[PDB]
């Protein structure tokens, strides 16, 4: 992994120390199985109880040493990682304050919580648990293998017969099901989607029923029969694959390989003893390597995702209230335009709206004017300056906006409307709310303007949208951008929201994403977009006389 490696650059030196301390602890936890062989040697030699007590103290001292080393290394690694976690959480904080604002409206990507919380927990477990586990799970089997090879190469190599048989059986079961193995994750995901549809589409099945229930059950039975036909023929392979690694088979083959040697006098009876101590569970050791290494990939993926977030492009700054657009071309994906050669100019103080078929770059164009993104070709010149050359302090003082998904902010209502100018007094906020037609509801709250807002509250969607509108009042700009869907997203508050958004709109170079064709009857300008290209330009009456796309669309409704 390249990105994951780049994220874990400052932890390489501590993690190398962890990979040695745990490799040491693994040997020390296998040491008493050497001292038992030594004890058997002494008892064959009949050494006096003093040497016996010396070896009994050696073993308990090594056990204490290996139990203290693990505690010390855990304590040290949980403070190596605990400060790298702080560094990462403080670095993502700076990165989040420099991404393009459209990044947080991305699609086909992990959620923010899945990117900052889960991918940090899976990194904490990559460092503190999974790397110790994965170095222990490789030191233990390899140390056991080399020790048993030192004891006797004959019975040591015999341990590989069951391992070779297991690998041969796994390979034979894999090659005969390569297409099935490839299909299985895809069928799992497809059936997950089908189950989701069957669950969210439950009421149709419950009431209308008929073909839908039978179709879902048929797909479920097809998946079940796919699994059964896949794995039923391999039961003959997959049962004998398990017996070969069982400790009883290892014990039997150890004894069949050693007892002839002992009786024939070809190896001392103590050289067989290490295999009995350690080599019995050797099969279950190598099966632990795979689960050990599986714990590194799950966290390396999280490291890759966080580094991908950290590698995103930043909101670059380069170099009369009139919004301009000239040869505006914008691509979401590589070489996939949605806006193509849009040239437009809005006079100061004019309420402008743009229309078109749903999914034609209208909201994308409005956001681009608001600078949620930067156009690939062309330039949007507000007051003669390209937006790309203005800082977040300057541009967003000249171009405010209230799009959909209005966001509340921590603090009370007084310090939720006055984010632009926190020095503003409560009276200014109150008159702003009165202009926004939200002062009536705020006074009805038990705490008035002192009610604490944040992630959630008792306010509905329309009410918090009105609060954001009131905030936009204080963030005075000669320009504004809007989405008409906000004007009627809340039917109960639709009238008050309309009055508020109109009051905000007054005497400002307002751009609106218009959907209802009847709402642009007396706007100052109208434009039509098709496949990212301009088709019609003019006022309401001019386009009515044109008889083109807009007239056909409005005659349909």
């Amino acid at each position: 992994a390249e990105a994951g490696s780049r994220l874990l650059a400052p932890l390489k030196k501590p993690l190398i120390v962890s990979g040695v301390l745990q490799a040491l602890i693994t040997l020390i936890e296998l040491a008493p199985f050497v001292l038992l062989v030594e004890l058997a040697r002494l008892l064959l030699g009949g050494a006096e109880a003093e040497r016996l007590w010396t070896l009994g103290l050696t073993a308990v001292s090594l056990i204490g040493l290996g139990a203290v080393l693990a505690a010390a290394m855990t304590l040290w690694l949980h403070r190596v990682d605990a400060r790298f976690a702080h560094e990462l959480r403080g670095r993502l904080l700076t990165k989040l304050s420099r991404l393009p604002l459209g990044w947080f409206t991305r699609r086909g990507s992990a959620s923010t919580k899945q990117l900052v919380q889960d991918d940090t927990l899976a990194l904490h477990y990559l460092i503190t648990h999974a790397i110790p586990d994965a170095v222990a799970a490789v030191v233990a089997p390899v140390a056991v293998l080399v020790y048993l090879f030192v004891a006797d190469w004959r019975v040591a190599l015999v341990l590989f017969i069951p391992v070779l048989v297991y690998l041969v059986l796994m390979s034979v079961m894999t090659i005969q099901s390569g297409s099935k193995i490839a299909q299985a994750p895809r069928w799992a995901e497809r059936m997950g989607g089908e189950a989701g549809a069957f669950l969210e589409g439950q009421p149709v099945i419950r009431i209308f029923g008929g073909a839908a229930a039978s179709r879902f059950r048929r797909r479920l039975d097809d998946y079940i029969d796919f699994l059964v036909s896949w794995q039923r023929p391999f039961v003959g392979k997959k049962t004998l694959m398990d017996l070969v690694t069982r400790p009883a088979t290892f014990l039997w083959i150890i004894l069949v390989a050693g007892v002839p040697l002992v009786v024939t006098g070809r190896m001392d009876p103590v050289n067989l003893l290490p295999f009995l101590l350690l080599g019995t569970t050797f099969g279950a050791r190598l099966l632990g390597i795979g689960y050990g290494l599986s714990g590194i990939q799950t966290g390396m993926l999280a490291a890759r995702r966080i580094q991908t977030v950290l590698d995103e492009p930043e909101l670059v700054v380069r170099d009369p209230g009139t919004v301009e657009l000239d040869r505006v071309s914008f691509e979401y994906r590589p070489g996939v335009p949605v806006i193509r050669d849009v040239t437009l100019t809005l006079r100061p103080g004019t309420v402008t709206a743009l229309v078109g078929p749903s999914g034609s770059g209208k909201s994308t164009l409005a956001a681009l004017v608001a600078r949620f993104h930067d156009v690939t070709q062309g330039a949007i010149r507000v007051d003669g300056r390209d937006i790309r050359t203005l800082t977040a302090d300057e541009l967003y003082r000249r171009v405010g906006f209230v799009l959909q998904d209005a966001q509340l902010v921590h603090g009370s209502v007084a310090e939720n409307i006055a984010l632009a100018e926190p020095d503003a007094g409560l009276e200014r906020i109150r008159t702003a709310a009165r202009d926004a037609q939200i002062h009536d509801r705020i006074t009805r709250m038990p705490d008035g303007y002192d009610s604490v807002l944040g992630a959630g509250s008792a306010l509905s969607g329309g009410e918090r949208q009105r609060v954001t509108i009131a905030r936009a009042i204080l963030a005075d700009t000669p320009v504004l951008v809007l989405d008409e869907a906000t004007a009627f997203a809340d039917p109960e508050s639709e009238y008050l929201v309309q009055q508020a958004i109109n009051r905000l709109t007054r005497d400002r170079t307002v751009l609106v994403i218009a959907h209802r064709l009847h709402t642009i009857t007396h706007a100052d300008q109208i434009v039509v977009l098709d496949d990212g290209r301009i088709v019609e330009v003019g006022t309401h009456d001019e386009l009515l006389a044109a008889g083109g796309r807009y007239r056909g669309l409005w005659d349909s409704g």
Partner: protein, 569 residues
Amino acid sequence: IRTLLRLVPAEKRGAVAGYAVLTLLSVLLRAVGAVLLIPLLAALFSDTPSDAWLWLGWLTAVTLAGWVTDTNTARLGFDLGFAVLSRTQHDMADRLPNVAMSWFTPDNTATARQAIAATGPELAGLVVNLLTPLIGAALLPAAIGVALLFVSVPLGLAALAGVAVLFGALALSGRLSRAADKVAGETNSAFTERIIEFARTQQALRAARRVEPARSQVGSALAAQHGAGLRLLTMQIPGQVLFSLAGQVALIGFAGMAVWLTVRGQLGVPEAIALIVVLVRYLEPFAAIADLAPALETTRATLNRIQAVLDAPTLPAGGAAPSIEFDDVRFSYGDEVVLDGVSFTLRPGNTTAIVGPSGSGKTTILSLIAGLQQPASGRVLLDGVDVTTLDPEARRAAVSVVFQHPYLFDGTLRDNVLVGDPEADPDDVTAAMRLARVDELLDRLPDGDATVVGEGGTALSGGERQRVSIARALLKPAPVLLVDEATSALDNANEAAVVDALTADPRPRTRVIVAHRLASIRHADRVLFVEAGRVVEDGAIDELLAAGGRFAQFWAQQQAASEWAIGST
């Protein structure tokens, strides 16, 4: 856990018994094979090496019998795994349609998704990859303790007394490991609650040109919390180290006892060494149970989810226009009331409008009429017959509905319409197209109603989806019709289709509508305004308008909004 024995079918009770008996046979055989090391190794290490052959003969016969019974157990395990997979999936598919819609909360829906989808490869191999190792390694230490008891009762007691100690050690290790991981995850999540709050609102802050103070505040909070977060770490120290120390101090204690008896004279050196080897075989099964802790935990979670599916509260059980009746009906998700004191008796052949704000339970009322759920309180009846007490055929064929969502099942347009009545003739289909205004879409489609309208087939907008949804309810011959829609001015064909549907439908049947717009609920004979789940007004449209109540104010405000535009007053 008793769930796993509940999942197995009644057919395979002849395989459950033949699996348990052969598992006990394999456990006793493994214990005997471990205990047979005592005379075998005693002859091996003594001054008569050749004597060990006979006990090697018994050991190899024991091993081959273990091979045969283990093959039988694993074959029956795979077969019973497929059988219980099929039983579990089919019982889930036969349960969920009968599960009340109240059970389908977002978290319950997610668990049901995982149970139906994610539990495929597991239940095919639970009893063979988990129960066989777990049961064969949990009963082997005690079995060896029993077997050594027949060699020396004090020796068997010494072996068996440690089994309880080491199982307690495994329980302690598991507790102190998983609790430590829980605490670690909780601390990691709590630290990052600030960054979520920042990231969600960072567009709003940017619009307020106040990003830098918020970033500095969150960074200062992170630094302050990490200052205390890098101290006082104790919990995970006795984690895996605890068991790794228990399963080594036990080995040293037992070996030291064996050599203490050796010097005391009760045992010889070969017996002491063979007992050391056997008392090591006594300890190896505890490692296997430790390695099965993650798999056992995951399987326990999945079996808990499957038991959640298999324990959801099912709905009990017991062609002119009917009458739908409501008597003090209430419904609530948790303690949040959705319906409060709703009562009506709509006469057959009537048309009624249920209206109000989104906080009410209009769609809840329609779903209760349709029999999607048992009401929390009150009684919902079809001419005095409670909906839950109908035969399934009558319940499914009683009501036709148009949902808030379209719920298109990704089929063809003809398939999307014919679910209302697959047995109907093409003339009824044509009537449905005429009334629902989908014929305008037939003008666009290449193949017409046979064209695929799936998510990847055709990118239909909201208007087409709602029109075909209207056609679905129109086609069905159900004696009762209901409509709940979210029609808007985005596509004006929607309201025209609804107006044609609820008016020109020639069949006689009770009709209900739920909508927000004006100038379309006129055709409803009655009106039932609802506020916070309680009916507040009743009567006709014009009657309520003349009465000057809540409906009149709603009409006035929505009329003012509808006439409004952008650019001037």
